[PDB]
Amino acid sequence: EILINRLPYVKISDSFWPPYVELLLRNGIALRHPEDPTRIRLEAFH
Amino acid sequence: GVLAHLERLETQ
Amino acid sequence: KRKAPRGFLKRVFKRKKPQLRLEKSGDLLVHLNCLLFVHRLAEESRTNACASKCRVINKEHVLAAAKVILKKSRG
Amino acid sequence: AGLSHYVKLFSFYAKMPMERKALEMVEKCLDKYFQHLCDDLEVFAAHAGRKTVKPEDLELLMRRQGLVTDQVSLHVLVERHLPLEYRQLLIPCAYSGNS
Amino acid sequence: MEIKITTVIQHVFQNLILGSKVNWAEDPALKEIVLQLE
Amino acid sequence: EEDALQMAVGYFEKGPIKASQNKDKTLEKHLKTVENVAWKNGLASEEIDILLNIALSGKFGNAVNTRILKCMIPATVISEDSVVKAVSWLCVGKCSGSTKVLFYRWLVAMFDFIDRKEQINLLYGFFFASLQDDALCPYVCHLLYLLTKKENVKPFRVRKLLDLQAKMGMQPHLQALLSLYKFFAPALISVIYFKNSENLWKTALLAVKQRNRGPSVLNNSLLLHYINCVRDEPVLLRFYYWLSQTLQEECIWYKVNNYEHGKEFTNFLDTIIRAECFLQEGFYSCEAFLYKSLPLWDGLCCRSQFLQLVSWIPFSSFSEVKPLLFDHLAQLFFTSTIYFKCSVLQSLKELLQNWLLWLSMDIHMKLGGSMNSVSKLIHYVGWLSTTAMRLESNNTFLLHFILDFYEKVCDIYINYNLPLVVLFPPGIFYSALLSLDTSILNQLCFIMHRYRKNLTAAKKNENFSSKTYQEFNHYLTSMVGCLHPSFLSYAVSFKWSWYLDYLFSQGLQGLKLFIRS
């Protein structure tokens, strides 16, 4: 959330505990980078 | 109206 | 199309090879494999169509697609 | 059936009209795809020494097909193509009860 | 620049008390925090 | 007993079906016969939709066997939706996807009966994030098509719908939802339609309807009132330019069909005509199209519409509108048949009222040179209507419409507060005085009686007096001595007062108003 607030598309650089990073991905909280899918963005709810 | 009617006594 | 047949892939995996123990959702992995294989088929067949500049995919493009992708998708 | 499902999905995957005569040959392509796969899962599961075919038994196979990489792992590949109620079975979510 | 955070944390409550083991509305705290007023 | 029976079903859920001494389908089927009469009270619908669907017994047949008929008798309440969103929790129990399909079909089918739809709309994202799974998309799409408000169209939802459209098919449900999101804030652009599938439920849902029964601006009438009230510059010009380019393009459309395009143009000119009759001022493209298309005009090409457009022509001067338009409503008036002739003095009859209205409040909102305009219009019609009297050898039909015009010239002072008593030109006055029917004779008599009334009213408040009173006393002494051929027809069909009574009684009301005066 800090990273999206100022923009980022990385925002975790593949943060750990993979059950968690994919948690906020299925519910639509965060989005995978469409090209390099090791970096995450928070879906831009702005 | 009597204009739409007057267009159908021109025919009829 | 938004589906993936649970029954069909399991029936195929049992008909073709009678001795396996494909896991609870392993057939879902098989569906993903075939989905991506047919993705590769569609895209490289589009490339084949642009190779001869044919605006409709035909037999002569699919047979060329097979010997590349099907061989590539072999493990 | 399922081959008819994939040829219809081919229509929405090729984004372009084809011929039915193309579809029964892509049917033989899927039949040979399984004729390579189900004995590729056979030999890969035998390589792991396990009778059953665990999900990592197929992750290695898809590494062989060049679709799993260090950039594109197994689970990310599930995001892009499988529907939600299906990837709920495959990639572990979290409820303190990860699937 | 703050409501734009309040429309971000809000929509990760509509997506965290949804995807988890939520037991969302059978609880009197979240019921006023979920159904978050726009 | 249903509340007792449903709590027994809950007990049937706190324990297994096997451990029960009686079948569930027996007691739940007694409840089902009750549903065939009355299925679930608001509290009953709430609870039986809550516990039967969260995790408990609720078999994907049994929970569905109820869910087919688990709707509401009075209305569905918020607490129904609340913890069934905790059935939408969609987890270890999840009320698995088939019952989810019937559940979202439940909401789609009964979206109309909720006391506070805003509460569910406030729950928009909880169902929007349920769009990603494949099995509920054809039904969740319908639900959000029913739930969508502007506060729920955040750009991330727009991008999620676009991602769903790209990943999945072009499915018409996604297209319908996209149509709504385009109807709201257009962060997306795209160009089936509430075709429901709850028709099978609409056996029960039609019973529910019966149960509730027993137990750019022309085609917008609600918005036409706005433009009626704003005589503003950038809106009467935003609208003028549309009317000019619709009455030009779609009238050039005549030059390629002239037969089938002659029915939408007629039906569009009818909408223009109605909009002007409501808004009550002539659209400034209605005249501007008329001056442009009157010289080119024929007699009968949209005559009924063109000669109602002439009625709504912004009073100009009758010195700047006469050469431009009235010199052509005489170029066709004197060359066309009676059936176009009567359609002009009627057209100009309505034009006279639509000019006199706008002159009455020109007295209300505080003349002479405006006076000269209606007076000259009436004289030019009075010139038009003496030579049209001559073209058709004193045809009674045409002079009937002439008097219908003059039926609105007698009452200028009484009706419109305008001092414009303009008498007959004699070429009509005596031509109807010595006419041959009474439905035109009593017509003239009514007009001149209203002329007596209007002149007497003008004498109270105050050229008119000298020559107008001279001409009306001319039309009086000549006629009052003359008051005869159609009266002779009556007399043949027929003691002077009894003759009168035979008259009078038989419809001669203009004669009544004169004779009493």
UniProtKB/Swiss-Prot annotation, chain A:
What disulfide bonds does the UniProt entry report for this chain?
none
Q: Where does the entry say this protein is expressed, by tissue? A: Detected in several fetal organs with highest levels in fetal liver. In adults, it is weakly expressed in lung and placenta.
Task: Give the location in the cell.
Answer: Nucleus; Chromosome, Centromere; Chromosome, Centromere, Kinetochore
Q: Which disease is it linked to?
A: Chromosomal aberrations involving CENPK are a cause of acute leukemias. Translocation t(5;11)(q12;q23) with KMT2A/MLL1.
Subunit and partners: Component of the CENPA-CAD complex, composed of CENPI, CENPK, CENPL, CENPO, CENPP, CENPQ, CENPR and CENPS. The CENPA-CAD complex interacts with the CENPA-NAC complex, at least composed of CENPA, CENPC, CENPH, CENPM, CENPN, CENPT and CENPU. Interacts directly with CENPH.
Function according to Swiss-Prot or TrEMBL: Component of the CENPA-CAD (nucleosome distal) complex, a complex recruited to centromeres which is involved in assembly of kinetochore proteins, mitotic progression and chromosome segregation. May be involved in incorporation of newly synthesized CENPA into centromeres via its interaction with the CENPA-NAC complex. Acts in coordination with KNL1 to recruit the NDC80 complex to the outer kinetochore.
The family line of this record is: Belongs to the CENP-K/MCM22 family.
What is this protein identified as?
Answer: Centromere protein K
What organism is recorded for this protein? Homo sapiens
Instruction: Tell me the organism's taxonomic lineage.
Output: Eukaryota, Metazoa, Chordata, Craniata, Vertebrata
Q: Which gene encodes it?
A: CENPK
UniProtKB/Swiss-Prot annotation, chain B:
Its localization reads: Nucleus; Chromosome, Centromere; Chromosome, Centromere, Kinetochore
Q: Which residues cross the membrane?
A: none
Q: Which domain of life is it from?
A: Eukaryota
Briefly, what is this protein's role?
Answer: Component of the CENPA-CAD (nucleosome distal) complex, a complex recruited to centromeres which is involved in assembly of kinetochore proteins, mitotic progression and chromosome segregation. May be involved in incorporation of newly synthesized CENPA into centromeres via its interaction with the CENPA-NAC complex. Modulates the kinetochore-bound levels of NDC80 complex.
Describe the subunit structure. Answer: Component of the CENPA-CAD complex, composed of CENPI, CENPK, CENPL, CENPO, CENPP, CENPQ, CENPR and CENPS. The CENPA-CAD complex interacts with the CENPA-NAC complex, at least composed of CENPA, CENPC, CENPH, CENPM, CENPN, CENPT and CENPU.
Q: Which family does it belong to?
A: Belongs to the CENP-O/MCM21 family.
Q: What is this protein called?
A: Centromere protein O
Source organism of the structure:
Homo sapiens (Human)
The full protein's residues present here are 16 to 27 of 300
Swiss-Prot record, chain C:
State one molecular function term (GO).
Answer: protein heterodimerization activity
CDD domains tied to this protein = HFD_CENP-W
What's a single GO CC term here? Answer: chromosome, centromeric region
Q: Which InterPro entries match?
A: CENP-W, CENP-W/WIP1, Histone-fold
Predominant place of localization? nucleus
Q: In which tissues is it expressed?
A: Highly expressed in ovary, liver, lung and pancreas and to a lower extent in breast and gastrointestinal tract cancers; such as those of the colon, rectum and stomach. Overexpressed in high grade breast invasive tumors. Expressed in many cancer cell types.
Describe the protein's quaternary organization and the partners it interacts with.
Heterodimer with CENPT; this dimer coassembles with CENPS-CENPX heterodimers at centromeres to form the tetrameric CENP-T-W-S-X complex, which is a subcomplex of the large constitutive centromere-associated network (CCAN, also known as the interphase centromere complex or ICEN). Interacts with NPM1.
- UniProt keyword Lipoprotein present: no
Cellular compartment(s)? Nucleus; Chromosome, Centromere; Chromosome, Centromere, Kinetochore; Nucleus matrix
Q: Which GO terms fall under biological process for this protein?
A: cell division; CENP-A containing chromatin assembly; chromosome organization; chromosome segregation; kinetochore assembly; mitotic cell cycle
User: Mind listing the UniProt keywords for this protein, alphabetically?
Assistant: Cell cycle, Cell division, Centromere, Chromosome, DNA-binding, Kinetochore, Mitosis, Nucleus
Q: Into which family does the record put it?
A: Belongs to the CENP-W/WIP1 family.
This protein is called what?
Centromere protein W
Swiss-Prot record, chain E:
Its localization reads:
Nucleus; Chromosome, Centromere, Kinetochore
Q: Which family does it belong to?
A: Belongs to the CENP-H/MCM16 family.
Assembly behavior: Self-associates. Component of the CENPA-NAC complex, at least composed of CENPA, CENPC, CENPH, CENPM, CENPN, CENPT and CENPU. The CENPA-NAC complex interacts with the CENPA-CAD complex, composed of CENPI, CENPK, CENPL, CENPO, CENPP, CENPQ, CENPR and CENPS. Interacts directly with CENPK. Interacts with KIF2C and NDC80. Interacts with TRIM36.
Function statement: Component of the CENPA-NAC (nucleosome-associated) complex, a complex that plays a central role in assembly of kinetochore proteins, mitotic progression and chromosome segregation. The CENPA-NAC complex recruits the CENPA-CAD (nucleosome distal) complex and may be involved in incorporation of newly synthesized CENPA into centromeres. Required for chromosome congression and efficiently align the chromosomes on a metaphase plate.
- Quote the protein name from its UniProt record: Centromere protein H
Protein source organism: Homo sapiens
